[PDB]
């Protein structure tokens, strides 16, 4: 059983966004971006990724959404597409959540990410 999970729509995957105050880091084989001008918002982390043997296999794109639907953060594999693992993703998600929590945002992870990247 090999499934592909799509938290994001075709338009959310292609939509463009800019950071009002850019903040960027390369975290091994993943790139983490966030707008540090976003404050006091409820944010949800949505991701499109493949799954094999009921565990995460490959991340395609992860984006952070406000309640208003705007993109304020992102975790994406480097353009060279060096391989990453679910560990790389889980750590990147922790880095991005802490970065967004600095300005008192409240970050949640989609249920698909919880079921397939973690074990709870």
């Amino acid at each position: 059983a090999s499934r592909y999970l799509t938290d994001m729509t075709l338009e959310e995957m292609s939509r463009e966004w800019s950071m009002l105050i850019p903040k960027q880091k390369v975290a091994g084989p993943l790139c983490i971006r966030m707008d540090q001008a976003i404050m006091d918002k409820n944010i949800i982390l949505k991701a499109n990724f493949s799954v094999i043997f009921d565990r995460l296999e490959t991340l395609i794109l992860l984006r952070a959404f406000t309640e208003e639907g705007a993109i304020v953060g992102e975790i994406s594999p480097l353009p060279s597409l060096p391989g990453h693992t679910a560990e790389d993703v889980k750590n990147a998600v922790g880095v991005l959540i802490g970065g967004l929590e600095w300005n008192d945002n409240t970050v949640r992870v989609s249920e698909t990410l919880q079921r397939f990247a973690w074990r709870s």
């Binding site: 084989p29 493949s50 094999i52 043997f53 009921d54 565990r55 995460l56 296999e57 490959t58 597409l81 060096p82 391989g83 990453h84 693992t85 679910a86 790389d88």
Partner: protein, 173 residues
Amino acid sequence: SLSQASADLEATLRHKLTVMYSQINGASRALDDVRNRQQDVRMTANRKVEQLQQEYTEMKALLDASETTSTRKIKEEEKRVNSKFDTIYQILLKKKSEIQTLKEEIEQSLTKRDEFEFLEKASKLRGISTKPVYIPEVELNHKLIKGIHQSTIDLKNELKQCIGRLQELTPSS
């Protein structure tokens, strides 16, 4: 003074021609180097693939062992009850033969029945009522049989989870 500047040029070029062969040869040895390097990563990769396949053949043979062991348990539970039924069948058949035999004697004692001597010969036959025997219940062990199947399904599920913990350790492309 110009036939001298051409001699000067000819001199600098033939010495620049020799530096050029040492670098053309140097380039050719660098080419051989990378071809040999990438040949080495092939041998390295094929050997690890060959080592992987020998592990999975061991695993497939473990499964074959487990399977024939579990089907041997089930088939020996089958033959346990079917043998107990076979001893029961032969009891009931023997009991059926005694009755069939004795009835035949009664049937051909009553064909010589109007001979005066019928009574003395047939007072023996009213007495034999050789009909008894108790048979205890034989019970196929359904719980055992179904449990082998249920925990064989468990084995599959923990195998699927084992595989998942392996593949998550490395990236996929």
